[PDB]
Amino acid sequence: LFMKALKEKFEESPEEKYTKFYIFGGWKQSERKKEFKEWADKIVEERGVPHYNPDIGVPLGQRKLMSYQVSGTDVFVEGDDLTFVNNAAMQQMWDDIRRTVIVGMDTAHRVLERRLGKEVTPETINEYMETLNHALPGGAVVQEHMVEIHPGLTWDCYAKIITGDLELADEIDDKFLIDIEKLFPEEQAEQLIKAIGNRTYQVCRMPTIVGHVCDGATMYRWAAMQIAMSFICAYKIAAGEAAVSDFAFASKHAEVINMGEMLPARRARGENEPGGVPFGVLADCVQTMRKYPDDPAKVALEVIAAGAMLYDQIWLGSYMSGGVGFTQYATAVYPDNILDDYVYYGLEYVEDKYGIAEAEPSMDVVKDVATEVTLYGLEQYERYPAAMETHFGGSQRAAVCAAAAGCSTAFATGHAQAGLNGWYLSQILHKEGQGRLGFYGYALQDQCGAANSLSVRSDEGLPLELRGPNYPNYAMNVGHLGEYAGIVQAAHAARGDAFCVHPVIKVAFADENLVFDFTEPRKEFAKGALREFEPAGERDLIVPA
């Protein structure tokens, strides 16, 4: 699986241990890095303060600087095209998640009847959605002399209904409905309807430009405000009356759903920020379980790709640190089909020894599956010095092998916690194998890992689905977070589950009016890498030509 890419990146056989260095022209071997100096030159000329400068400190490219095939594709690009700041698709994936809030409609509709004395029917509910889709992007419904927001800036904002009440579902305009039966395979569809019940929801997607100027905790305040404005308009109550405060409180607290919850004082942040988003939830955002129900590995691999990207490149590599960042800490798990080979083989192993999702969760299965796949993955890096030179950091080496091990153990049991326990066995194996593990503080998690995995104490116990970047061990270091989401997806994909932890968030991200395509994150990244992705939120309308 990784051979084709290994032979494109490297002149020599993947097997060879020797090559030439210091003979590439230094910095200036690369198309991208040349482009960057050109722009730097024009900038400093107009500006007067020095900017980007190859000749400062280290001369990049004394080795050949690699291209990377985005795994699962046939697109080869420079590493510089997979930094989130350089890649529009990567920015748009985060944008679509941050700008998503889902609100319960049930108690709101109850208020209208029990307190305001107005009938709620499908006819009025559709009228309401015509209104909400005028109001959400910044349109006026009640007050005279209202200024408004340019629809050209907000063409990505809208709302739709999710409802497990199938009788209401086909009374709602199709254009206002995220249809569970249309979007999903038959059995995933029924599993979702059952999990959701006859509860009906309002999926609001705010303008990307608003996330650009503001933040994530803006998102729900914005959703709540325009929802209340639309109720007022459509049901002809007083535009400001006692029961309206029920709408504010239902939408903002009692019946609300956000992709992330707030974070504590040291990493102080409001809602819908990357660190508040749990592994199971990020996994249910990705929609690969929809398209490839019978390939547990693709579904998991695809979840790793957008986990590592989101959590390492954008979250840890910017929000929590910044600078050049953590591109290749993340890329180690979605370029070059290296992890892909390790994962698939591990599944072939489980498929043989046990059944898919048929193994009793036990120390025995972990001890077997984890050790087998970690030795395999370790042995691939020492067989192919080319792959070793590709994944030059140990952190990303540990992550690739532990992910394969972890997901494989999940493939057998179908249980995230077991899978996680296999991750922590894999790591402590890698340690003694190469006489190293990762960067300095890489193994804080993994050394706490075994004891906290099954523990039930205060800030120790919690199923992996429910864990995230705020789980104490997990809050600091790269090469862990997105891979954990992969283990959550692996467990649940092996079982054939429609979702990992949230029915509604799952259906919501299935909607075809999103900008990012969440079925195929890897292919999107390459689309952004080749500068072919069209993001929202660009201000070229309100700016000179």
Partner: protein, 436 residues
């Protein structure tokens, strides 16, 4: 289970002490230290005078021009104190104590336990004690009504605009509830440098103060509870109260020539000789040891961790590699035995991130600025911070952010209080009487 208790010089001070007597809810001295921590506050009168003298309030380079104000705070420290104990006292015969320190530059305000008693927020004593200082300055220094808000700011900084008393001149060992990493993390959010400053660089007494504060949070968080209570009781006796003189004896013999490896081997021999551990099976050349008592084995390894730091960092007289010591003491100790290190991985776990975040660009700092509530060092349940306090005490002056830079006020005023400075004698004495 009965541990012997020895002092900071290795002499025996209590016989068969049942470990059940060592829990915070059983131990009177620990109970009182918690009370004394909610009631004891440090106020910088010189700092408030400077701030008001130059209108530099709110802190961090700020100055409100044209609002300067020449009042004399220090000179009237005595008069200010008197007004404070007037506002603060509940009964004529209670433990209110408000005494000027260092020629009036500093001020210790200890609230009556009657005020503690009915206090939910543990830091709150600062509001009460501080608001006294505020009022006492206004109507002793005759402050103008329109400029009184400047005194509020010199005392409490940017509060309420900031979450804390930013740029203020009020301090305690505790700091504000919304800075907590979790429920019950209050007694965890106390700097190692605070710990070391208040025990005046006495290593054994720093270890103690860190351990008892840590293990009291372990009880408060429901960690030292159920099938875990014993893990922390024995862990606490050996780590912080020099149980069996084990920390002291290891360091007496390993102190001149020993390393972290020799201390590791010292732990394995002593558990071997005491039937704490045995030989499970014998591999092709090397022994896999089992634990006859998992809690007492952890306790044993934990004690050796403190000794490991004291011997290692004490030899360098540099704090720094306390993070390596904790990491590698537990690393070695495991692959010497086939058993888990202190805290079943978490102790070594903390030291990996600690090592990282004390040797890189991304955050952290030097050893003294961590605490039980730092996200980098919150992971281990009481067994890592007391080591870090030994190291920072054994430092002859290699740290930029030392106890003299970060923890000056605390060191000067809290250092004067006895149960803060020397908590061992008090806890062990309390434990003796409690055992009748």
């Amino acid at each position: 289970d009965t541990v012997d208790l020895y002092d900071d010089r290795g002499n025996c001070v209590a016989e068969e002490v049942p470990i059940e007597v060592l829990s915070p809810m059983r131990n009177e001295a620990i109970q009182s230290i918690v009370n004394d921590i909610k009631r004891t506050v440090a106020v910088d009168l010189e700092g408030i005078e400077n701030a008001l003298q130059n209108a530099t309030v709110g802190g961090k380079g700020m100055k409100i021009p044209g609002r300067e104000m020449d009042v004399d705070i220090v000179d009237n420290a005595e008069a200010i104190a008197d007004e404070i104990e007037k506002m603060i006292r509940v009964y004529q015969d209670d433990d209110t104590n408000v005494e000027p320190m260092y020629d009036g530059k500093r001020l210790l305000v200890q609230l009556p336990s009657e005020r503690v008693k009915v206090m939910a927020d543990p830091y709150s004593g600062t509001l009460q004690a501080g608001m006294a200082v505020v009022h006492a300055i206004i109507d002793v220094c005759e402050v103008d009504m329109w400029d009184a808000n400047m005194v509020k700011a010199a005392v409490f900084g940017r509060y309420p605009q900031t979450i804390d008393y930013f740029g203020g001149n009020v301090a305690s060992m505790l700091d504000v509830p919304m800075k907590q990493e979790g429920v019950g993390y209050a007694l965890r959010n106390i700097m190692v440098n605070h710990i070391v400053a208040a025990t005046r660089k006495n290593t054994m007494q720093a270890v103690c103060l860190a351990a008892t504060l840590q293990q009291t949070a372990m009880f408060e968080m429901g960690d030292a509870l159920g099938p875990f209570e014993r893990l922390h009781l024995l862990g606490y006796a050996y780590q912080g109260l020099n149980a069996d003189n084990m920390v002291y004896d290891i360091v007496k013999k390993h102190g001149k020539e020993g390393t972290v490896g020799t201390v590791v081997r010292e732990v394995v021999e002593r558990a071997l000789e005491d039937g704490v551990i045995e030989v499970k099976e014998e591999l092709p050349s090397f022994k896999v040891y089992k634990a006859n008592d998992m809690d007492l084995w952890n306790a044993y390894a934990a004690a050796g961790l403190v000794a490991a730091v004291m011997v290692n960092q004490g030899a360098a007289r540099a704090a720094q590699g306390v993070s390596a010591t904790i990491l590698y003491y537990n690393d070695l100790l495991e692959y010497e035995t086939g058993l888990p290190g202190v805290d079943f991985g978490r102790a070594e776990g903390t030291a990996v991130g600690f090592s990282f975040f004390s040797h890189s660009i991304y955050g952290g700092g030097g050893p003294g600025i961590f605490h039980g509530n730092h996200i980098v060092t919150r992971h281990s349940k009481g067994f890592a911070i007391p080591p870090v306090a030994a190291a920072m005490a054994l430092d002859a002056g290699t740290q930029m952010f030392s106890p003299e830079v970060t923890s000056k006020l605390i060191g000067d005023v809290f250092g004067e209080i006895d149960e803060f400075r020397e908590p061992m004698k008090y806890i062990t004495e309390a434990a003796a009487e409690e055992a009748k």
